[PDB]
Write an enzyme that holds these catalytic residues in place. Structure first.
Site, short mmCIF file in Angstrom:
data_model
loop_
_atom_site.label_atom_id
_atom_site.label_comp_id
_atom_site.label_asym_id
_atom_site.label_seq_id
_atom_site.Cartn_x
_atom_site.Cartn_y
_atom_site.Cartn_z
N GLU A 276 0.86 -1.22 0.00
CA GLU A 276 0.00 0.00 0.00
C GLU A 276 0.89 1.26 0.00
O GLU A 276 0.66 2.21 -0.78
CB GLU A 276 -0.94 -0.08 1.20
CG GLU A 276 -2.03 -1.12 1.05
CD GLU A 276 -3.05 -0.83 -0.02
OE1 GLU A 276 -2.97 0.21 -0.69
OE2 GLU A 276 -3.90 -1.72 -0.26
N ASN B 245 -7.53 8.98 -6.01
CA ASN B 245 -8.30 8.01 -6.81
C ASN B 245 -9.02 8.80 -7.90
O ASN B 245 -9.23 9.98 -7.72
CB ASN B 245 -9.22 7.21 -5.89
CG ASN B 245 -8.49 6.50 -4.76
OD1 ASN B 245 -8.88 6.60 -3.58
ND2 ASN B 245 -7.44 5.79 -5.10
N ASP C 43 -12.03 8.84 -8.68
CA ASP C 43 -13.34 9.32 -8.19
C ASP C 43 -13.20 10.57 -7.31
O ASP C 43 -14.23 11.09 -6.87
CB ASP C 43 -14.08 8.17 -7.48
CG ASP C 43 -13.61 7.94 -6.05
OD1 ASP C 43 -12.46 8.25 -5.76
OD2 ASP C 43 -14.43 7.52 -5.19
N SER D 16 -11.67 10.71 -4.35
CA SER D 16 -11.26 10.29 -2.99
C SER D 16 -9.74 10.17 -2.93
O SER D 16 -9.08 10.19 -3.96
CB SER D 16 -11.92 9.01 -2.60
OG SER D 16 -11.52 7.92 -3.43
N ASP E 283 -6.43 8.12 -0.69
CA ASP E 283 -5.94 7.09 0.24
C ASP E 283 -4.81 7.68 1.06
O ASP E 283 -3.92 8.36 0.51
CB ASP E 283 -5.45 5.89 -0.55
CG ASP E 283 -6.50 5.16 -1.36
OD1 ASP E 283 -7.71 5.27 -1.09
OD2 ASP E 283 -6.05 4.44 -2.30
N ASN F 161 -9.14 5.13 2.75
CA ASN F 161 -9.78 5.96 1.70
C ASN F 161 -10.81 6.90 2.31
O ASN F 161 -11.67 6.48 3.13
CB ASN F 161 -10.39 5.04 0.65
CG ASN F 161 -11.02 5.75 -0.51
OD1 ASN F 161 -12.22 6.01 -0.49
ND2 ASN F 161 -10.25 5.96 -1.56
#
Ligand SMILES: [Cl-]
Ligand code: NA
EC number: 3.2.1.17
Length: 129
Positions: free
Chosen positions: A35, A46, A48, A50, A52, A59
């Site tokens: 990660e 991301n 969309d 969002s 992380d 998220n």
């Protein structure tokens, strides 16, 4: 902070992740490696909108508030910055809620794709724990 492999293993164990919802500590260290590469300050935007955040790339769509994810929840009731701290408490507490949501560690796509079914105890071997 970029954690040592064994250093992160020790922190995740003291915060109660070893065998949390049945996932051995190696699973958690494997998930963090792919990660964030053990970098507490990791972020990734991301498609969309969002983001992380931190060692386990948690998220903003569901889990934390960053004030810039329209229509998102904050189910861990924390600022997403909290997840970038050199201290992993907020990330571990949030991750306990995530792994309890129903799909276990499949919530971390990198764990499902790169850790799941491998010799994950290799990630803690040689570590004073
Ligand atoms: Cl499970
Ligand atoms: Na959010």
């Amino acid at each position: 902070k970029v954690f040592g492999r064994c250093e992160l293993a020790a922190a995740m164990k003291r915060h109660g992740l070893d065998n949390y919802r049945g996932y051995s500590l190696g699973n958690w260290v494997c998930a963090a490696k792919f990660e964030s590469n053990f970098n507490t300050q990791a972020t990734n935007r991301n498609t969309d909108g969002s983001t992380d955040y931190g060692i386990l790339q948690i998220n903003s769509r569901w889990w934390c508030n960053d004030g810039r994810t329209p229509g998102s929840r904050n189910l861990c009731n924390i600022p997403c910055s909290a997840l970038l701290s050199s201290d992993i408490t907020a990330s571990v507490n949030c991750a306990k809620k995530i792994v309890s949501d129903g799909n276990g560690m499949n919530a971390w796509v990198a764990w499902r794709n790169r850790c799941k079914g491998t010799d994950v105890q290799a990630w803690i071997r040689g570590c004073r724990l």
